[PDB]
Amino acid sequence: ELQVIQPDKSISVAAGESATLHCTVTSLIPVGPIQWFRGAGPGRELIYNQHFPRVTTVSDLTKRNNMDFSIRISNITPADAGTYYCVKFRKGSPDHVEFKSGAGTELSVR
Numbered sequence: 001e002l003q004v005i006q007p008d009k010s011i012s013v014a015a016g017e018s019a020t021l022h023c024t025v026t027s028l029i030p031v032g033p034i035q036w037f038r039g040a041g042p043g044r045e046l047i048y049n050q051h052f053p054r055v056t057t058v059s060d061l062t063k064r065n066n067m068d069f070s071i072r073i074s075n076i077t078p079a080d081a082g083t084y085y086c087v088k089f090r091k092g093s094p095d096h097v098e099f100k101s102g103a104g105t106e107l108s109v110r
Contacts, residue, residue, distance in 0.1 A: 002027040004034075004088050006102035013076045014110045020058060021105055022070040023086030030099060032091040034069040038082045040104065047071070047084065078109045 003026040013019045025034065036048040036055075048055045048071050058070035069086055086102035 002029065002088060002100055004086055004100050004102040006086055006105050008105045009103075010106035010108065012108045012110060015077050017076055019073045019076050019080065019107055020070060021073065021084050021086075021107070022058075023068075023102055025067045025069065025088060028065070028067070030090040032089045032096050032099065035087050035089060036069075036071055037085050037087060038080075040083070040085055040101065044085075045082075047073070076107070076109055081107055081109045083107075 005024050005026065007022055011019060011021070021036070023034070023036075033050050035046065038045040038047050050061060054074045056072050058072055059066060059068040061069075073080065083104040083106050085104045088099045088101075089096035090099040
């Protein structure tokens, strides 16, 4: 069964530096997008969906068999502090449905 693995429980970044948030999936099935959020609450913030100026993917997503969905966030400030979740969605009608979430990585800003 598909796992969403966020190895880092927490990371510590100096304001102005970049944060690398790691996430890998263990399957391409079921088919559907990976999204990053800050928070797991009902008003969680969208951080990345396959636009946001300061985010890039660590790996090349336009590549068959890719299972790395780690992201890099540039120019970190205290406004970025929080817990970041990598979330797999299954494709559906009308829209994609949340399938499974990674464990969360806490970003502290020094």
